[PDB]
From a paper:
The assembly of tau into amyloid filaments is associated with more than twenty neurodegenerative diseases, collectively termed tauopathies. Here, we describe twelve phosphomimetic, serine/threonine to aspartate, mutations in tau, which we termed PAD12, that collectively induce the *in vitro* assembly of full-length tau into filaments with the same structure as that of paired helical filaments extracted from the brains of individuals with Alzheimer’s disease. The tau sequence ([Fig fig1]) comprises an amino-terminal projection domain (residues 1-150), a proline-rich region (residues 151-243), four microtubule-binding repeats (R1-R4; residues 244-368) and a carboxy-terminal domain (residues 369-441).
0N3R and 0N4R versions of PAD12 tau were expressed in *E. coli* and purified, followed by *in vitro* assembly under shaking conditions (**[Fig fig1]**; **[Fig figs1]**; **Methods**). Assembly was carried out with 500 rpm orbital shaking (2 min on; 1 min off) for 7 days at a protein concentration of 100 µM in a buffer containing 100 mM potassium phosphate at pH 7.2, 400 mM potassium citrate and 4 mM tris(2-carboxyethyl) phosphine (TCEP). 0N3R-PAD12 tau primarily formed paired helical filaments (PHFs) (66%), with a minor population (14%) of single protofilaments with the Alzheimer fold. Because tau filaments from AD brains contain equimolar amounts of 3R and 4R tau, we also assembled a 1:1 mixture of 0N3R-PAD12 and 0N4R-PAD12 tau under the same conditions. The PHFs were identical to those found in AD brains, with a backbone root mean square deviation (r.m.s.d.) of 1.4 Å (**[Fig fig1]**). We then used a biosensor cell line that overexpresses hemagglutinin (HA-)tagged tau297-391 in HEK293T cells (see **Methods**) and compared its seeding response to increasing amounts of PHFs made with tau297-391, PAD12 0N3R or PAD12 0N3R:0N4R (**[Fig fig5]**). Comparing the recombinant PHFs of tau297-391 and PAD12 0N3R or PAD12 0N3R:0N4R tau, we observed efficient seeding at low concentrations (∼5 ng) of PAD12 PHFs, whereas tau297-391 did not lead to seeding at the same concentrations.
Numbering used by the authors:
A (entry chain C), B (entry chain E), C (entry chain F), D (entry chain A), E (entry chain D), F (entry chain B): 307 to 378
Write the structure that this text describes.
């Protein structure tokens, strides 16, 4: 007899009184790339020649990850 | 007998009193890429020659990921 | 006997008192790409030569991902 | 007797065998100015808040400046 | 008796066999200026808050400046 | 008796066999200025808050300056 019975009662929580006055001001820039050949196969993930800017301000932004497995 | 019975009662939660006054102001830039040949196969993911800008301000933005598996 | 009976009663939740006063103002830029040959096959995902701007302000923006699997 | 008799027989000269293959490619940018009061009077020359690009390719472009003065 | 008789037979000269293959490629940038009051009078020359680009390729570009003066 | 009689027979000269393969590639940058009051009078020349780029390639680019004066 096999019984699998994990119990989860957890909390991930935040409080923030006021969130703001955020300034993001990058001063440009320059990028150059040279190549002759590219050859990509099974599950390649790639990024060539970027100049990318991100502002990310979540009011919460909490994460939880679970993985429940049984196997014979 | 096999019984698979995980129980989840978890919480992911947030409170934010006021969210704002966010400024995102990038000053341009320059990108150059050279190649002769590209050849991409099974599940390739690619980005060549970008100048990309993102502002992301979710009021919550909480994440939960689950995976429940049984296998014989 | 095989019983598969996961129970989920979990919550992903947010409150935000006021959301706004967000400014996104990029200053242009320049992008150049050269190649002679391309060949893309099974499940290729690609982006060549971009200058892309995104503003994303959801009032919630919460995410939940599930996967329930059984196999013999 | 007063005699004013300058003699000018001078030359300003050029030769250029071939002219070209010139590239001018700026990557944008960002400019901000704040003030409350302006007051400009006699022979003021002014420029507030600029993002200006110039390409200038004259085949000659030679200059000669003269000033001849007499006074009693 | 007053005689003013300067003589000019001078040369300003150039030869250039071929002029070219010139690249000017700046990567953007950012400028900010604050003030409350400006007050400009006799013969003021001014520039506030610039991001300016110049390419100048004259085939000759030679200069001569003269000033001939008499005064009593 | 007053005689003023300078003689100029001078040469300013250049030869250049081939002029080129010139690259000018600045990488952006950031400038900030704060002030309360400015007050400019007789023959002020001024520059506040610049991010300026110049490429200057004359095929000749020779200069001569003269000044001939008599005074009583």
């Amino acid at each position: 007899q096999i019984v699998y019975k994990p119990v989860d009662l957890s909390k991930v929580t935040s409080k923030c009184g006021s969130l703001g006055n955020i300034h993001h001001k990058p001063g440009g820039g320059q990028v150059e790339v040279k190549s002759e050949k590219l050859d990509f196969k099974d599950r390649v993930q790639s990024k060539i020649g970027s100049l990318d800017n991100i502002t990310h301000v979540p009011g919460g932004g909490n994460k939880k990850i679970e993985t429940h497995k049984l196997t014979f």
